Amino acid sequence: ANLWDYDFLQSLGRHSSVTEEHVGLAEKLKGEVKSLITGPMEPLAKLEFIDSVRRLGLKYQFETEMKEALANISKDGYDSWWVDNLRATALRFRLLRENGIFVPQDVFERFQNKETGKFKNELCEDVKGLLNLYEASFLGWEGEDILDEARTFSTAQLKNVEGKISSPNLAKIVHHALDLPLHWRAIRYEARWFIDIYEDEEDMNPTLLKYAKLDFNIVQSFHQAEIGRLARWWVGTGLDKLPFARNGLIQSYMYAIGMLFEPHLGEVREMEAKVGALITTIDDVYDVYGTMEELELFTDITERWDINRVDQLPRNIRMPLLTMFNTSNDIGYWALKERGFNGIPYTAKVWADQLKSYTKEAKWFHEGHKPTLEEYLENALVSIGFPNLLVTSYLLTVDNPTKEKLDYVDSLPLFVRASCILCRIINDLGTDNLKSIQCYMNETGASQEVAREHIEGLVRMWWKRLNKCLFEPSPFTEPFLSFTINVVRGSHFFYQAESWTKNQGMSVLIHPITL
Ligand SMILES: C=C1CC[C@@]2(C(C)C)C[C@@H]12
């Protein structure tokens, strides 16, 4: 049991402690959870149950029932159960907005002083109210000034009352929230954390908890089989023996699990994990290893999709190039075989764009250029690799793929571009004139502190644009809508170190939950 050892990883999938007993039991428990979601409950208890299902990582199992239950609740007429109750108002606001039912920000106006616009100090003691208002504030859109205030008020008040909480479970939950709000957390990682928290909750439903543990283990069995296949592939490429990208395959796979964890998306997840491993490896080629002539040739070969000159590159560069080429061809071919559409033009194109973006960064560094923040981000939203990963994910999943459809996604419309910019700025915040904070410092003369606060403000702004894009009609469908949001959550989760990562990998991918 070592997450960084390829002998161990290549053995995964061979055995699993998940039995067909476990699977029949999961089918019976699923039917009872489904019935609990659709069945009688008081509305606040129903909101709390639905929120728990999501946090345990099970929305993917009960999407239709959860939407059906919230739709019934939203069209009630009776509102005494929530009106004048901050906790209930805030939970309802968030769950309805998460599930495509609009609630206006003015539901919070009654909790503000009419003269200052400030939240009332009498709320400064209601911990679960404050917590629900904090988590709700992240579902806000641009110009929803009450929700911007709700965030700053609830953050300040929670920081002040965290140490006054009596319930150890509630204290842990509030600490967790102040680190990252639930809206920004990666689903699969939050599910493993929350299974242990939920077990200790007063209101805990034992049927739901048992289902959550069983489903967690069943899903984890698919992940172990994928890791096995990917580790055997990676060792096959020989890139594991290369002087750089230490732990690139398993780091990529852990990122991919943030993007998409469901078993039915296993083949797509494996291909996203391959691309991510290659991105990390080639990033090091362009950053540390290659000479400018080597990198110009790598870029030209990729732009032309023409490997005639590849033997001019040294072995440690030639092997990443040809693995990128071969895997891009394999992924485009999977689209032809499985989806009826040859994807090679699109995998080749996004790799050429990505290497051009690396080449521009390398030229800026070589020539001592200081780009503006805007000039930097225009290139760095491509260099982060998410146009590559997201266009690929759309290629593999869209119904009735066409050149028109792939050309639109590849043009990075606002919804997609917002996700790519977020992933770049979150990475950059997770730590040189070529990173977000330093560019803004060069452009404005701001301090590190002030430049960091500006870039944090850009994270909040681009989230508000994503949030609103999801209430708008879209040419996109599931699962691509979810991928776009979930790559950002993956970025937040991994850019908040080697023991923390290993713990996440071992607890989510390697060790089953004890039943
Ligand atoms: C630069 C990045 C951000 C995305 C990435 C992951 C998939 C390992 C390739 C690395």
Map residue 1 onto helix, strand or coil.
coil
Single-letter amino acid code for the residue at 407: D
Å from CA of 296 to ligand 1 middle = 22
Å from CA of 202 to ligand 1 middle = 40
CA 496 to chain centre: 13
Angle between helices 373-383 and 436-444 (to 10 degrees): 170
Å from CA of 240 to ligand 1 middle = 17
Integer Cα distance of 68 and 349 in angstroms: 41
CA–CA distances in Å: residue 322 to residues 44, 258, 505:
56, 28, 29
Å from CA of 120 to ligand 1 middle = 43
Binding residues for Mg(2+): 283, 287, 361
Torsion on CA atoms 507, 393, 487, 172, rounded to nearest 10 = -30
Q: How many helices (H) and strands (E) does the chain have?
A: 23, 0
Listed in sequence order, the residues at least 6 apart from 260 whose beta carbon sits closer than 8 Å to its beta carbon are: 268, 269, 272, 393, 479, 482, 483, 486
H/E/C letters for each residue in 348-388? HHHHHHHHHHHHHHHHHHHCCCCCCHHHHHHHHHHHCCHHH
CA 95 to chain centre: 19
CA–CA distances in Å: residue 283 to residues 274, 356, 384, 401:
14, 12, 9, 30
| Angle at 254 (CA atoms; ends 249, 256), nearest 5 degrees | 90
CB 475 within 8 A of CB 220: no
Q: Which two tokens stand for residue 202?
A: 């007063």
H/E/C letters for each residue in 161-219? HHHHCCCHHHHHHHHHHHHCCHHHCCHHHHHHHHHHHHHCCCCCCHHHHHHHHHHHHHH
What is the chain's alpha carbon radius of gyration, rounded to the nearest angstrom?
24
CB 478 within 8 A of CB 409: no
Which of 279, 327, 358, 386 is the best mutation target for the ligand 1 pocket, counting ligand atoms within 8 Å of the beta carbon and taking the most? 279
Q: Which two tokens stand for residue 59?
A: 């929305």
Q: Where in the chain is the domain with CATH 1.10.600.10?
A: 219-515
Give the chain's length. 515
Candidates 278, 235, 207, 234; CA nearest to 53 is 207
Angle between helices 43-55 and 206-237 (to 10 degrees): 20
Integer Cα distance of 278 and 262 in angstroms: 23
Integer Cα distance of 320 and 249 in angstroms: 13
Q: Which two tokens stand for residue 358?
A: 């690396």
Quickly tell me which residue has 């060792």 as its tokens. Answer: 235
Return the sign of the alpha-carbon dihedral for residues 138, 411, 478, 482.
Answer: negative
Quickly tell me which residue has 């959860």 as its tokens. Answer: 66
- Residues forming beta bridges with residue 119, ordered by sequence position: 112
DSSP assignment of 80-120: TTTTT-HHHHHHHHHHHHHTT----GGGGGGGB-TTT-PBP
Residue 119 φ/ψ, nearest 5 degrees: -65, 150
Residue 112 φ/ψ, nearest 5 degrees: -110, 155
Map residue 5 onto helix, strand or coil.
coil
Integer Cα distance of 371 and 436 in angstroms: 10
Quickly tell me which residue has 């194109």 as its tokens. Answer: 349
Q: Determine if residue 316 is left, alpha or beta; phi over 0 gives left, psi from -120 to 50 gives alpha, anything else beta.
A: alpha
Q: Which atom of ligand 1 is nearest to the CA of 248?
A: 8
Binding residues: 283, 287, 361
CB 348 within 8 A of CB 328: yes
Tell me, using a 6 A CB cutoff, whether residue 490 lines ligand 1.
no
Single-letter amino acid code for the residue at 177: A
Residue 287 φ/ψ, nearest 5 degrees: -90, -45
CB 384 within 8 A of CB 423: yes
Return the sign of the alpha-carbon dihedral for residues 42, 43, 48, 54.
Answer: positive
Residue with CA at minimum distance from ligand 1 atom 3: 384
Residue with CA at minimum distance from ligand 1 atom 7: 276
Listed in sequence order, the residues at least 6 apart from 379 whose beta carbon sits closer than 8 Å to its beta carbon are: 357, 360, 361, 371
Quickly tell me which residue has 């915040």 as its tokens. Answer: 429
Map residue 440 onto helix, strand or coil.
helix
CB 323 within 8 A of CB 239: yes
User: Around Cβ 487, how many Cβ atoms within 10 Å?
Assistant: 27
CB 317 within 8 A of CB 293: no
Q: Determine if residue 165 is left, alpha or beta; phi over 0 gives left, psi from -120 to 50 gives alpha, anything else beta.
A: beta
Tally of CA atoms within 13 A in the half-sphere of 344 that contains its CB: 12
Listed in sequence order, the residues at least 6 apart from 89 whose beta carbon sits closer than 8 Å to its beta carbon are: 82, 83, 107, 108, 111, 132
Q: CATH top-level class for 19-218?
A: mainly alpha
Return the sign of the alpha-carbon dihedral for residues 159, 163, 166, 167.
Answer: positive
User: Across 217-362, where does the E strand assignment appear?
Assistant: none
Burial letters 231-245, b for 16+ CB under 10 A, else e = bebbbebebbebebb
Quickly tell me which residue has 């239950």 as its tokens. Answer: 69
Where would I find the H helices in 367-447?
373-383, 386-397, 403-410, 414-429, 436-444
Q: Which atom of ligand 1 is nearest to the CA of 423?
A: 3
Q: What is the CATH topology of the domain spanning 219-515?
A: Farnesyl Diphosphate Synthase (1.10.600)
Listed in sequence order, the residues at least 6 apart from 124 whose beta carbon sits closer than 8 Å to its beta carbon are: 130, 157, 160, 161
Q: Where in the chain is the domain with CATH 1.50.10.130?
A: 19-218
DSSP assignment of 440-456: HHHHH---HHHHHHHHH
Tally of CA atoms within 13 A in the half-sphere of 281 that contains its CB: 28
Report cis status (omega within 30 of 0) of the bond before 479. Answer: yes
- Residues forming beta bridges with residue 112, ordered by sequence position: 119
User: Around Cβ 505, how many Cβ atoms within 10 Å?
Assistant: 21
Tell me, using a 6 A CB cutoff, whether residue 280 lines ligand 1.
yes
Q: H/E element holding 59?
A: helix 59-74
Q: Which two tokens stand for residue 264?
A: 């039915």
Å from CA of 385 to ligand 1 middle = 6
Residue 487 φ/ψ, nearest 5 degrees: -60, -30
Integer Cα distance of 276 and 106 in angstroms: 43
Integer Cα distance of 275 and 252 in angstroms: 8
CB 263 within 8 A of CB 219: yes
Tell me, using a 6 A CB cutoff, whether residue 286 lines ligand 1.
no
Map residue 18 onto helix, strand or coil.
coil
Map residue 13 onto helix, strand or coil.
coil
Own/partner pairs, 315-318, CB within 8 angstroms, 24+ separation:
316/242, 316/243, 316/289, 317/285, 317/289, 317/290
| Angle at 9 (CA atoms; ends 8, 15), nearest 5 degrees | 80
Candidates 50, 83, 55; CA nearest to 66 is 50
Residue 381 φ/ψ, nearest 5 degrees: -70, -20
User: Around Cβ 312, how many Cβ atoms within 10 Å?
Assistant: 12
Q: Which atom of ligand 1 is nearest to the CA of 272?
A: 7
